[PDB]
Each structure stands twice: as structure tokens, then as C-alpha cells.
């Protein structure tokens, strides 16, 4: 796994930045549309619910970056 991560990174650090951004944005957009064309499947609703939970994590660390995400304890 270390060799695969280092190989993927050294293939990734050879690109310019706009190529990286459009490649990752294109892959993310295709993988969103493959789960949005799935309607009624349980894995699709769980997929988009986990995407929304990741967006919650990003908003919650944007609200208080020294404390982490807000955990109702």
C-alpha cells in the first residue's frame, strides 16, 4: 500500500495543477452522476447521504477550526 501510494503520488506530482484539478473534478462529477442515475437503490441514497455528511464535516470544521467538528456529546 505504501508503494502504491508513492507511485500514485509521484505520477500525480508530475502533472501541472490545472490538469490535476480538472481530472479530479471530472472523476468526482462522473462518480456523482453514476450514483444520481441510480434512484431507488439503497446504496445510492447511502452514497449521497455520505456525500452530504462529508459536506457537513467541511462546514463544521469551517465553523470552528481549533475545536474540530461539532459532536453532540
Amino acid at each position: 500500500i505504501e508503494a502504491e501510494a508513492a507511485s500514485i503520488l509521484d505520477r500525480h506530482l508530475a502533472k501541472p495543477v490545472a490538469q490535476i484539478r480538472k481530472e479530479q473534478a471530472s472523476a468526482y462529477a462522473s462518480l456523482l452522476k453514476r450514483a444520481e442515475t441510480a434512484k431507488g437503490a439503497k446504496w445510492a441514497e447511502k452514497y449521497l447521504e455520505d456525500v452530504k455528511a462529508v459536506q457537513w464535516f467541511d462546514a463544521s470544521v469551517a465553523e470552528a477550526p481549533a475545536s474540530g467538528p461539532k459532536v453532540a456529546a
Partner: protein, 61 residues
């Protein structure tokens, strides 16, 4: 043949052999390294809005 006693190298050729490359401005280093160290600040500070420290060493609640 007065034209053959003038210098045959044109003023164009002088201006293209003297100013051959467009020189690098000194503010280009500042604006480029600032636009990249803004990303170094964003990922790695503990006061940025998008820090990587919760995506990397998650938490222990």
C-alpha cells in the same frame, strides 16, 4: 550604391538580438509563491477554514 556602406544589420535585427527574451519581472516570484503558500497556509495552519488536520489525524471523541 550608398546603401551598401550602411550597416547591413537592420535596426530590427539589433532589437531582436539585444532584447531576445522577455525578462522576468521581480514581482512574478512574489505573486506565484504567495499564491502557492496560500495553499500551504490553508492546508497546514490550525487556524484556516479548511485545515487538513481533521482529514488526516481524525479526532478521538
Amino acid at each position: 550604391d550608398r546603401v551598401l556602406s550602411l550597416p547591413a544589420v537592420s535596426k530590427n535585427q539589433v532589437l531582436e538580438n539585444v532584447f531576445h527574451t522577455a525578462p522576468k519581472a521581480p514581482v512574478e516570484h512574489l505573486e506565484k509563491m504567495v499564491s502557492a503558500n496560500s495553499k500551504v497556509y490553508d492546508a497546514l495552519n490550525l487556524q484556516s477554514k479548511r485545515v487538513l488536520i481533521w482529514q488526516v489525524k481524525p479526532a478521538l471523541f
